[PDB]
Write a protein that binds this ligand. Structure first.
Ligand code: HEM
Length: 152
């Protein structure tokens, strides 16, 4: 897992996200949808968005971005002791939303990209390393739940 120092880095970086959750959430989803169009198809409520301009102007997309990052933030603050918070998320995304683990890899990468884009020069090598480890832990624990369900 992560060391105490690494978790402190993760939560310090997260402070940046919390200053503008909607903005970060919106950019993460737009990065995901524009870089991997197949992901948009998983959202019946966002498949009407044919352009990035429409995505940017969508208040409902910003709303979902807030829901997504608020959930992730709650998980991150548990510093790995997130079974109760993560299990239900893993099961809903596998059985209900049908989200391949590959898409979770895509959104993890999108988060790192957005952090650099919104905070250039202020997301250090150590910070990136820590956030990456936290996102991999998140993804890997979801993957374990996916295997349990036999979900691909
Ligand atoms: C940072 C990783 C993610 C987090 C924390 C997250 C969190 C959530 C939460 C809290 C909800 C609402 C509750 C629920 O249905 O469980 C939700 C809904 C949903 N998520 Fe995710 N999600 C993540 C990644 C993804 C990815 C990668 C996809 C597909 C590309 C996806 C697709 C969906 C869909 C389709 C819904 C239902 C939306 C609706 O129509 O209301 N999620 N997600």
């Amino acid at each position: 897992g992560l060391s105490d120092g690494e978790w402190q880095q993760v939560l310090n970086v997260w402070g940046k996200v919390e200053a503008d959750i909607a903005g970060h959430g919106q950019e993460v989803l737009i990065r995901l949808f524009t870089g991997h169009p197949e992901t948009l198809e998983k959202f019946d409520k966002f498949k009407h968005l044919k352009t990035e301009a429409e995505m940017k102007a969508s208040e409902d997309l910003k709303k979902h971005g807030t829901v997504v990052l608020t959930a992730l933030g709650g998980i991150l603050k548990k510093k790995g002791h997130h079974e109760a918070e993560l299990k239900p998320l893993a099961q809903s995304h596998a059985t209900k939303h049908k989200i391949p683990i590959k898409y979770l890899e895509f959104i993890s990468d999108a988060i790192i990209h957005v952090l650099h884009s919104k905070h250039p020069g202020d997301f250090g090598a150590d910070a990136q390393g820590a956030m990456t480890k936290a996102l991999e832990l998140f993804r890997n624990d979801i993957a374990a739940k996916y295997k349990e369900l036999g979900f691909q």
